[model samples]
Target: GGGGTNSGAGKKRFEVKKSNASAQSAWDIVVDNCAICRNHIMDLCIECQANQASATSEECTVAWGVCNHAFHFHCISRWLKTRQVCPLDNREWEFQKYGH
Candidate 1:
């Protein structure tokens, strides 16, 4: 009887641990993955273009998380200063690398 009770407790613990592991994995993925988009890079009401290699400039590079999405410096700075998120998505903004 004691062994049976111990086994049950162990099983419960295992299940709890499994659930916690899954939740942690999801959290890690979210942190490692890039959630922001290029649209979020827009700073003003201008054309709002995505960062391109050729067009790249000190004003167009930043570490926008896993996406590594780059934007014109003027674009993001202006956007953050004036607004909070992308024009269409409206997601929360994050810190990005500058002059990349």
Candidate 2:
């Protein structure tokens, strides 16, 4: 179920495991934009709405989270394999990590 713009940008690898005495595996995504940037859920800035500030579509994606949450393949791929922890959930999530 891998899907996204590769663009030859590096890959962000990570891992995942179970919350038990036994270690399961890992998981991962990517990071192409900001880690904790403000994003538009329905297409609007969430920060401005909460802070009573001007909002617009020019939002930012979080760089410290999952690809779905806001990450780029190039940014997190290396870390995914090295750190093996999703910058967001802090859960391991690397493709290879899962195989093990």
Candidate 3:
């Protein structure tokens, strides 16, 4: 008889390696203000947001990231803690060349 049917086929396993660039989304920007704080790159950032009367350019330093996406130092400082990615581009903050 067909008693030799005991030799069944074997199953297979698989694995894959990839970059962490799978995430994607829509976005925009305005150099006049910090994408993180909407501050006018003027004086106090979101940190000292209520300090309009006491705001000073020195108190809030302008920081450049993701190209022309200028932002306040204080704003970005707080943003960095929550997320190190670009708030505007919604991408990894490479701190590299930006804009066209």
My TM-score estimates for the predictions, one after another, are 0.31, 0.27, 0.51
Per-residue C-alpha lDDT of model 3 across residues 1-100, encoded as one tens digit per residue:
5655565656555647656786565555687777677667644676565665354545466567754466766667677778877777676655433222
Q: Give residue 39's error in model 1 in angstroms.
A: 12
Model 1 C-alpha lDDT per residue in residues 12-74, reported as the tens digit of each score? 533333453544533222322222333334232134233343444322334452234445455
Which wins on TM-score, candidate 1 or candidate 2? 1
What is residue 65's positional error in candidate 3, in angstroms?
A: 1.0
Give the best candidate by lDDT: 3
Model 3's TM-score against the true structure: 0.51
Ranking by TM-score: 3, 1, 2
List the lowest-lDDT window of 10 residues for candidate 2: 58-67
